[PDB]
Amino acid sequence: WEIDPKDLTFLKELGTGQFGVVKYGKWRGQYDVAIKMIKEGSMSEDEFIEEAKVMMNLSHEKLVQLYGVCTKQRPIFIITEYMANGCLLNYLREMRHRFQTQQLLEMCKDVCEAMEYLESKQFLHRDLAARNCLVNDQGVVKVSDFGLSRYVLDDEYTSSVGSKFPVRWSPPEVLMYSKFSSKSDIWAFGVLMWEIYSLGKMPYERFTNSETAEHIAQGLRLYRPHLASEKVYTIMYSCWHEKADERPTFKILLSNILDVMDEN
Ligand SMILES: Cc1c(NC(=O)c2ccc(C(C)(C)C)cc2)cccc1-c1cn(C)c(=O)c(Nc2ccc(C(=O)N3CCOCC3)cc2)n1
């Protein structure tokens, strides 16, 4: 969907991301949207435009929808669903003292539903983390910016030794071989559950990226957050098998989470 930029009203600055400026606005004076203004040089644009239909056709209640693009001008725009509560990582830290454990599990379920959908579509997120989940006005968590890491033009982000590469969310085979698969998203999802249950702490805080890489390659795993039951920790820990083929699918994780909910 090529959106007519005349149909967009910019209303508020939402900050800056790895493509530059993002704004809150309305489409046809009614629907809230977020608008990424793709900073020139920041994205592999012809690759993106060439491949974006698959990403727009991803449709699920727990994905932050890509509604369309504006490509007949520069900078190009990516128009998405608007999420009033911003990123999950901040939401966790801001409301840290208010969450009940049932709500944390619900958040895990939301993310797991989105990822099971993506898995079913053989579509990789590649940068799953609380910072890449957003929260709407009703506390529903949704997965954002799935697939976009592929188009990033920034050596600090694209190199596994870059300062921006999501090392703390990456399995050994990504760190060593750049081998992304369903099972590297699984690993990241485990780390995301850990961010949720730790109420937004940084994974491997006080370790550098390279120290993190070194020690996880040797078997170091994130400790159980105080708020995680042993059953919940078992679920997140299952995502961290050194060998990719020993990790669960998102279908299995979803069943695991639903079982805990029913037990609860
Ligand atoms: C996704 C995003 C980025 N980041 C990126 O664009 C980005 C680009 C590429 C990547 C890859 C690395 C994966 C390629 C990652 C991220 C940067 C800035 C804003 C948003 C964003 C988006 N949406 C769709 C919202 O609904 C929303 N909503 C907000 C709502 C509220 C607030 C806010 O200021 N709040 C929250 C409520 O309490 C008051 C303070 C902030 C944002 N904020």
Coordinates of N, CA and C and ligand atoms in Angstrom, one line a residue, residues 14-20 22 34 36 64 80-87 125 127 131-132 134 144-146 148-150 152 157, ligand 1:
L14 N 8.0 11.8 18.2 CA 8.0 10.6 19.1 C 9.4 10.2 19.4
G15 N 10.4 10.9 18.8 CA 11.8 10.6 19.1 C 12.5 10.1 17.9
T16 N 13.7 9.5 18.1 CA 14.5 9.1 17.0 C 14.9 7.6 17.2
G17 N 14.9 6.9 16.1 CA 15.3 5.5 16.1 C 16.4 5.2 15.1
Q18 N 16.6 4.0 14.8 CA 17.7 3.7 13.9 C 17.6 4.0 12.5
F19 N 16.4 4.2 11.9 CA 16.1 5.2 10.9 C 15.9 6.7 11.0
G20 N 16.2 7.2 12.2 CA 16.0 8.7 12.3 C 14.6 9.0 13.0
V22 N 10.9 9.7 14.1 CA 9.6 9.1 14.1 C 8.5 10.1 14.6
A34 N 2.0 6.0 13.5 CA 3.3 6.5 13.7 C 3.9 6.5 12.2
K36 N 7.6 6.9 10.3 CA 9.1 6.9 10.3 C 9.5 7.7 9.1
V64 N 2.8 -4.9 15.7 CA 2.5 -3.5 15.3 C 2.5 -3.4 13.8
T80 N 3.0 3.1 10.4 CA 2.6 2.0 11.2 C 1.5 2.3 12.2
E81 N 1.0 1.2 12.8 CA 0.1 1.3 14.0 C 0.7 2.2 15.1
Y82 N -0.1 3.0 15.8 CA 0.4 3.8 16.9 C 0.1 3.1 18.2
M83 N 1.1 3.2 19.1 CA 1.0 2.5 20.4 C 1.3 3.5 21.5
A84 N 0.2 3.9 22.2 CA 0.2 5.1 23.0 C 1.2 5.0 24.2
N85 N 1.5 3.8 24.7 CA 2.4 3.6 25.8 C 3.8 3.5 25.5
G86 N 4.2 3.6 24.2 CA 5.6 3.5 23.8 C 6.2 2.1 24.0
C87 N 7.6 2.1 24.1 CA 8.3 0.8 24.1 C 8.1 0.0 25.4
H125 N 12.2 -12.0 12.9 CA 12.2 -10.7 13.5 C 13.6 -10.1 13.3
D127 N 15.7 -8.8 15.5 CA 16.0 -8.0 16.6 C 14.9 -7.9 17.7
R131 N 12.9 -3.5 23.8 CA 12.9 -2.2 23.2 C 12.2 -2.2 21.8
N132 N 12.0 -3.4 21.3 CA 11.3 -3.6 20.0 C 10.0 -4.3 20.2
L134 N 6.1 -2.7 21.7 CA 5.4 -1.5 22.1 C 4.1 -1.8 22.8
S144 N 7.3 -5.0 17.4 CA 7.5 -3.9 16.4 C 8.8 -4.1 15.6
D145 N 8.7 -3.7 14.3 CA 9.9 -3.5 13.5 C 10.5 -4.9 13.2
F146 N 9.7 -5.9 13.1 CA 10.1 -7.2 12.7 C 10.7 -7.1 11.2
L148 N 13.0 -5.4 9.8 CA 13.7 -4.2 9.4 C 15.2 -4.2 9.6
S149 N 15.7 -4.9 10.5 CA 17.2 -5.0 10.8 C 18.0 -5.2 9.5
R150 N 17.3 -6.0 8.6 CA 17.9 -6.4 7.3 C 18.3 -5.2 6.5
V152 N 19.2 -2.1 7.6 CA 20.0 -1.1 8.3 C 21.3 -0.9 7.6
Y157 N 25.8 -1.3 13.7 CA 24.7 -2.2 14.0 C 24.8 -3.5 13.3
Ligands
LIG1 C1 9.5 2.5 16.9 C2 10.0 3.9 17.3 C3 11.4 4.2 17.2 N1 12.2 3.3 16.7 C4 12.3 3.0 15.4 O1 11.7 3.6 14.6 C5 13.2 1.8 15.0 C6 13.7 1.6 13.7 C7 14.4 0.5 13.4 C8 14.6 -0.5 14.4 C9 15.5 -1.7 14.0 C10 16.8 -1.6 14.7 C11 14.8 -3.0 14.5 C12 15.7 -1.8 12.5 C13 14.1 -0.3 15.7 C14 13.4 0.8 16.0 C15 11.8 5.5 17.6 C16 10.9 6.4 18.2 C17 9.5 6.1 18.3 C18 9.1 4.8 17.9 C19 7.6 4.5 18.1 C20 6.9 3.8 17.1 N2 5.5 3.6 17.3 C21 4.8 2.8 16.3 C22 4.9 4.1 18.4 O2 3.6 4.0 18.5 C23 5.6 4.9 19.3 N3 4.9 5.4 20.4 C24 5.3 6.1 21.4 C25 4.3 6.5 22.3 C26 4.6 7.3 23.4 C27 5.9 7.7 23.7 C28 6.2 8.5 24.9 O3 6.9 9.5 24.8 N4 5.7 8.1 26.1 C29 4.9 6.9 26.3 C30 3.6 7.3 27.1 O4 4.1 7.9 28.3 C31 4.7 9.2 28.0 C32 6.0 8.9 27.3 C33 6.9 7.3 22.8 C34 6.6 6.5 21.7 N5 6.9 5.1 19.1

